[PDB]
Write a protein that holds these residues in place. Structure first.
Motif, PDB file in Angstrom:
ATOM      1  N   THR A   1      10.020  11.831  -3.344  1.00  0.00           N
ATOM      2  CA  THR A   1       9.988  12.892  -2.352  1.00  0.00           C
ATOM      3  C   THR A   1      10.273  12.292  -0.983  1.00  0.00           C
ATOM      4  O   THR A   1      10.233  11.076  -0.800  1.00  0.00           O
ATOM      5  CB  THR A   1       8.638  13.619  -2.359  1.00  0.00           C
TER       6      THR A   1
ATOM      7  N   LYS B   1      -0.478  14.970   2.184  1.00  0.00           N
ATOM      8  CA  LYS B   1      -1.692  15.057   1.377  1.00  0.00           C
ATOM      9  C   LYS B   1      -1.881  16.441   0.771  1.00  0.00           C
ATOM     10  O   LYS B   1      -2.794  16.648  -0.034  1.00  0.00           O
ATOM     11  CB  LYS B   1      -2.908  14.690   2.223  1.00  0.00           C
ATOM     12  N   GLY B   2      -1.070  17.409   1.169  1.00  0.00           N
ATOM     13  CA  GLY B   2      -1.260  18.738   0.629  1.00  0.00           C
ATOM     14  C   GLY B   2      -0.302  19.166  -0.451  1.00  0.00           C
ATOM     15  O   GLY B   2      -0.469  20.257  -1.001  1.00  0.00           O
ATOM     16  N   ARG B   3       0.694  18.347  -0.776  1.00  0.00           N
ATOM     17  CA  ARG B   3       1.791  18.800  -1.617  1.00  0.00           C
ATOM     18  C   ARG B   3       1.352  18.975  -3.061  1.00  0.00           C
ATOM     19  O   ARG B   3       0.474  18.264  -3.553  1.00  0.00           O
ATOM     20  CB  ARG B   3       2.953  17.816  -1.542  1.00  0.00           C
ATOM     21  N   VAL B   4       1.962  19.946  -3.732  1.00  0.00           N
ATOM     22  CA  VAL B   4       1.733  20.214  -5.144  1.00  0.00           C
ATOM     23  C   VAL B   4       3.065  20.070  -5.860  1.00  0.00           C
ATOM     24  O   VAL B   4       4.057  20.685  -5.459  1.00  0.00           O
ATOM     25  CB  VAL B   4       1.136  21.614  -5.364  1.00  0.00           C
ATOM     26  N   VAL B   5       3.088  19.256  -6.908  1.00  0.00           N
ATOM     27  CA  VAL B   5       4.303  18.973  -7.658  1.00  0.00           C
ATOM     28  C   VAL B   5       4.188  19.629  -9.024  1.00  0.00           C
ATOM     29  O   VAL B   5       3.188  19.448  -9.726  1.00  0.00           O
ATOM     30  CB  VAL B   5       4.542  17.462  -7.788  1.00  0.00           C
ATOM     31  N   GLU B   6       5.207  20.395  -9.389  1.00  0.00           N
ATOM     32  CA  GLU B   6       5.268  21.081 -10.671  1.00  0.00           C
ATOM     33  C   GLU B   6       6.203  20.295 -11.579  1.00  0.00           C
ATOM     34  O   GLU B   6       7.387  20.133 -11.270  1.00  0.00           O
ATOM     35  CB  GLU B   6       5.758  22.514 -10.486  1.00  0.00           C
TER      36      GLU B   6
END
Length: 54
Positions: free
Chosen positions: A27, A43-48
């Motif tokens: 990323t 610190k907030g990211r969400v990975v699918e």
RNA sequence: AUGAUUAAUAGGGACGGUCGGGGGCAUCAGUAUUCAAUUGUCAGAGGUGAAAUUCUUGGAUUUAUUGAAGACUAACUACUGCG
């Protein structure tokens, strides 16, 4: 007149030990600057990701 | 002979195991809807048979994270159920 793509790093996403393929991908984040860090923008990211890939 | 007609594929009532989207709602939800805060990006986005009114460096549309209000309870859903 800025070209904002050549100012970002690349960070390697790591999965927990409950899965076997712990390398998910990479990323982009901007540089750390005066009172603007790269970690708090990260610190907030969400990975699918598909569970068949893990 | 001391004295009561059956027990209606009439009706009411009791009982038994069920059945159903039948009758206020307590919340438990819901891959969605205009909105709000933060984030990335760069020129158009809507909308139409074609368009135009509209919103667009105050960064729209799109994208991510987190919220708050908002018929029904989509698909299941049918020559199926209950009243």
């Amino acid at each position: 007149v800025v070209d904002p793509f050549t100012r970002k790093e690349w960070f390697d996403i790591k999965a927990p030990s409950t899965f076997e393929n712990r390398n998910v991908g990479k990323t982009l984040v901007n540089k750390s600057t005066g009172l603007k860090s790269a970690s708090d923008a990260l610190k907030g990211r969400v990975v699918e990701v598909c569970l068949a890939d893990l």
